[PDB]
């Protein structure tokens, strides 16, 4: 629907998709705990930073879908549709992350910088010198999935096929295409595991197979494929939009772009602001209420679905002073863009690394980069959990 009073802004419909921020601010001020009638049913939205951050660590906001279901029917059901950690609660979540963390290390993420810088340069060389091009499809879409390929150790021949299948999930609409692309990804990854079981290498897939703890416990076929699938889902579309929204932020702010060109080393700090200013994960994945929770005088009953407004919260003036202004020189301190608590983005370090390499190399390579269309001529994807551009037409300019 829409907001109410003073002046009303569209929600998850119409004008919302071009700029959801005026709508986000109205909610924060007038209506911060709101049951929203969506296509996929009724979900609650928390928009105030303080509530969002609290909700993240509150155990009463569970990742278990069974909390919607009555008492006597929960014994029947699995805790998860697939054994992914983002859908799991403690202590099951604790064991899974502990075991994957033995392979998906901050070191391994950081070790990819040379391989990341290669992928970026390869696409930059493949972009035209003269004339307009689509920066989303021809650059922004391509970096993350190829980083994910290097991570998992997907064969070089099949990398372009892998890239295409994942892009169908990122893409706007068709559902059957999204359901079948999942199918041949899940097929390819499961197939790949067994090939790495007899021919191992230095890549993450082969690394995850051999993982043990103190007790001698490991990962089975189910969990390994589910982790592979999650790494791709949670790390492709999300990273694409950090690159996308971040480049947009610079092109639509001539002052800040001057600051970065005159001082390239600001890029690490710049990424941090792009994540706060225009958060690619607009709302966090669904949480379910185990018991009744109260926020801003509104009680969400037990069994309801809750989304945490990350993009909204990151512009709360109670947290951040002058929060609508883009300042790359800022100090992040507690941006809920990577989440907060037990579920905090497990690939967050890879995400920042890809963020600085993609955005930093591009503006170095193409200093006279410009938008090819007006800001109101830009089209965003109409998806709940994402803020992101379907296309970004840019002129590369001379030199
Ligand atoms: C800048 C881009 C990214 C953003 C904004 C982002 C955001 C998030 C957020 C908000 C969560 C928590 C979801 C929740 O609490 O419901 C999350 C979880 C996760 N992200 Fe990311 N992410 C990004 C990139 C990546 C990358 C590159 C990877 C690695 C391939 C990754 C892997 C994960 C995983 C595995 C989780 C689940 C952690 C857990 O629950 O134990 N993400 N991400």
Swiss-Prot record:
<keyword id="KW-0503">Monooxygenase</keyword>
<dbReference type="Pfam" id="PF00067">
    <property type="entry name" value="p450"/>
</dbReference>
<dbReference type="GO" id="GO:0005737">
    <property type="term" value="C:cytoplasm"/>
</dbReference>
<protein>
    <recommendedName>
        <fullName>Vitamin D(3) 25-hydroxylase</fullName>
        <ecNumber>1.14.15.15</ecNumber>
    </recommendedName>
</protein>
<keyword id="KW-0349">Heme</keyword>
<dbReference type="InterPro" id="IPR001128">
    <property type="entry name" value="Cyt_P450"/>
</dbReference>
<feature type="binding site" description="axial binding residue">
    <location>
        <position position="345"/>
    </location>
    <ligand>
        <name>heme</name>
    </ligand>
</feature>
<dbReference type="GO" id="GO:0005506">
    <property type="term" value="F:iron ion binding"/>
</dbReference>
<keyword id="KW-0408">Iron</keyword>
<dbReference type="InterPro" id="IPR017972">
    <property type="entry name" value="Cyt_P450_CS"/>
</dbReference>
<dbReference type="InterPro" id="IPR036396">
    <property type="entry name" value="Cyt_P450_sf"/>
</dbReference>
<dbReference type="GO" id="GO:0020037">
    <property type="term" value="F:heme binding"/>
</dbReference>
<comment type="similarity">
    <text>Belongs to the cytochrome P450 family.</text>
</comment>
<comment type="function">
    <text>Hydroxylates vitamin D(3) into 25-hydroxyvitamin D(3) and 1-alpha,25-dihydroxyvitamin D(3), its physiologically active forms. Also displays 25-hydroxylase activity on vitamin D(2) and 7-dehydrocholesterol. May play a role in the biosynthesis of steroid metabolic intermediates.</text>
</comment>
<dbReference type="InterPro" id="IPR002397">
    <property type="entry name" value="Cyt_P450_B"/>
</dbReference>
<keyword id="KW-0479">Metal-binding</keyword>
<keyword id="KW-0560">Oxidoreductase</keyword>
<keyword id="KW-0963">Cytoplasm</keyword>
<dbReference type="GO" id="GO:0047748">
    <property type="term" value="F:cholestanetetraol 26-dehydrogenase activity"/>
</dbReference>
